[PDB]
T-cell receptor
Framework: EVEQDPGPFNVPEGATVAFNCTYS??????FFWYRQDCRKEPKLLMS???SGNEDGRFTAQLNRASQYISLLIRDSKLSDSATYLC???????????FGSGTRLLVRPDIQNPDPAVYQLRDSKSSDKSVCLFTDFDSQTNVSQSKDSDVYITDKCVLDMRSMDFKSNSAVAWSNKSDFACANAFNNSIIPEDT | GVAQSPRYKIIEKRQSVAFWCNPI?????LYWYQQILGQGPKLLIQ????????DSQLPKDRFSAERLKGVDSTLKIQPAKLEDSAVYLC?????????FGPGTRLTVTEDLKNVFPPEVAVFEPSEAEISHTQKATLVCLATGFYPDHVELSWWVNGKEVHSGVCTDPQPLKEQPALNDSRYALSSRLRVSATFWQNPRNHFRCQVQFYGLSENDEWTQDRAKPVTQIVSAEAWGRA
């Protein structure tokens, strides 16, 4: 039995985030934190050595007497968003047991919000459109559509890395003949509505 | 690293599957895991060389696996159930530390007639965003696809880009009520206003869809939904 935080952890960028994981067999010898994006495989984040481990923002600790390992992420960044797997060998064997995972989502620090809702025309001439709600800060949340035949994506953070500019956006669209962007992005923030 | 084939597979319930894995060269231990959305990897079988050391967790009379020569290994599900939809992970090791392959995402579905390729459209940046922000967000829409086995990528002048992109982590069900609902997926690419206004810059949104093969019987009036790429494109505009 390997047990870790149920999660999820939803923290603002910059926050310290603490994970803890407990293992039931005292004889267990090898301990790891693995990380996993949603459509990917487990990759090793750090082994947890007898003295623990340190790597930049990341610290791990082993308390063998109490039978737990810890992971501490300081000054968390958007790139830390992933699922964190606790991993401990089945006592007195090479087989590994994986915990159920803790989902971490780090929200981007948006300092220059400029919330706006824009309409965008298809590049192929079909007079079809989508709606873009963008440049809002990470304290704005986006709810699923409450209307059938209306579609609203969750928010999504893009990173114009060359310059250190992030920005949030969500997409909405509908085939309903009178659909207008305000019908999906109803009152949420003070956006410029062109 | 560890290699696995395929990356995605759609099968009808009752059919069989195979998953192939190739350890890191010389690794004596090989592991298969099932991982369903929300949980960790769970072991199904360990081989140490070509010897089956622990198959106690191997479900029932539907899961088998072979590592006949102690190198690569084949896991099989026969026949398959909808509850088998999961990612199947392969990992190899010498000692404790395991190294994973990229996984095979499995979706088992009632009826292969539920399978549809995506349709892809690119929506051009708003003139109002350009003047308000000096930037240009293009949006890509993949709609109507099933299963949720796609890879969406952005290409600028023949060239794949990652900066200024984000693609929804999860698709939306176009009919949440239904179990076989088709899916939609949006992505954005953001560039500078100057870059978008240059009419020699070429933008393409590419969606790789994993579907049926030439070996699948098909009798719907639409064409077989084979694994394919569907894309849409736009040039910058002055």
């Amino acid at each position: 039995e390997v047990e870790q935080d149920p999660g999820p952890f939803n923290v603002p960028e910059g926050a310290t985030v603490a994970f803890n994981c407990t293992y039931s067999n005292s004889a267990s010898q090898s301990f790891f934190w693995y990380r996993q994006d949603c459509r990917k495989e487990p990759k090793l984040l750090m082994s947890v050595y007898s003295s623990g481990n340190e790597d930049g923002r990341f610290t791990a600790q082993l308390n063998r007497a109490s039978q737990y390992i810890s992971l501490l992420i300081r000054d968390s960044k958007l790139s830390d968003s992933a699922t964190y797997l606790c991993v401990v060998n089945r006592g007195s064997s090479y087989k590994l047991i994986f915990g159920s995972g803790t989902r971490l989502l780090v929200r981007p620090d948006i300092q220059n919000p400029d919330p706006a809702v824009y309409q965008l025309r298809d590049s192929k001439s079909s007079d079809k459109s989508v709606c873009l709600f963008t440049d809002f800060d990470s304290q704005t949340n986006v709810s699923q559509s409450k209307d059938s035949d209306v579609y609203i994506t969750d928010k999504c953070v893009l990173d114009m890395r060359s310059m250190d500019f992030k920005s949030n956006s969500a997409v909405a669209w509908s085939n309903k003949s009178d659909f207008a962007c305000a019908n999906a992005f109803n009152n949420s923030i003070i956006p410029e509505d062109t | 690293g560890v290699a696995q084939s395929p990356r995605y597979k759609i099968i009808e319930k009752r059919q069989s599957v195979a998953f192939w894995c190739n350890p890191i060269s010389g690794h004596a231990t090989l592991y298969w895991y099932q991982q369903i959305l929300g949980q960790g990897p769970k072991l199904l079988i360990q081989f140490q060389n070509n010897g089956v050391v622990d198959d106690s967790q191997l479900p029932k009379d539907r899961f088998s696996a072979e590592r006949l020569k102690g190198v690569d290994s084949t896991l099989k599900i026969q026949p398959a159930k909808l509850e088998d939809s999961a990612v199947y992970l392969c990992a190899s090791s010498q000692t404790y530390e395991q190294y994973f392959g990229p996984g095979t995402r499995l979706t088992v579905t009632e009826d292969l007639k539920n399978v549809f390729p995506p349709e892809v459209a690119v929506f051009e940046p708003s003139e109002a965003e350009i003047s308000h922000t000096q930037k240009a967000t293009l949006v890509c829409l993949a709609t109507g696809f099933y299963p949720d086995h796609v890879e969406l990528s952005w290409w600028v002048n023949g060239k794949e880009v990652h900066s200024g992109v984000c693609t929804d982590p999860q698709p939306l069900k176009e009919q949440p009520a239904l179990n076989d609902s088709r899916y939609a997926l949006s992505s954005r690419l953001r560039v500078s206003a100057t870059f978008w206004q240059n009419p020699r810059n070429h933008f393409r949104c590419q969606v790789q869809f994993y579907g049926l093969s030439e070996n699948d019987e098909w009798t719907q009036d639409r064409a077989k939904p084979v694994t394919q790429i569907v894309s849409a494109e736009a040039w910058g505009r002055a």
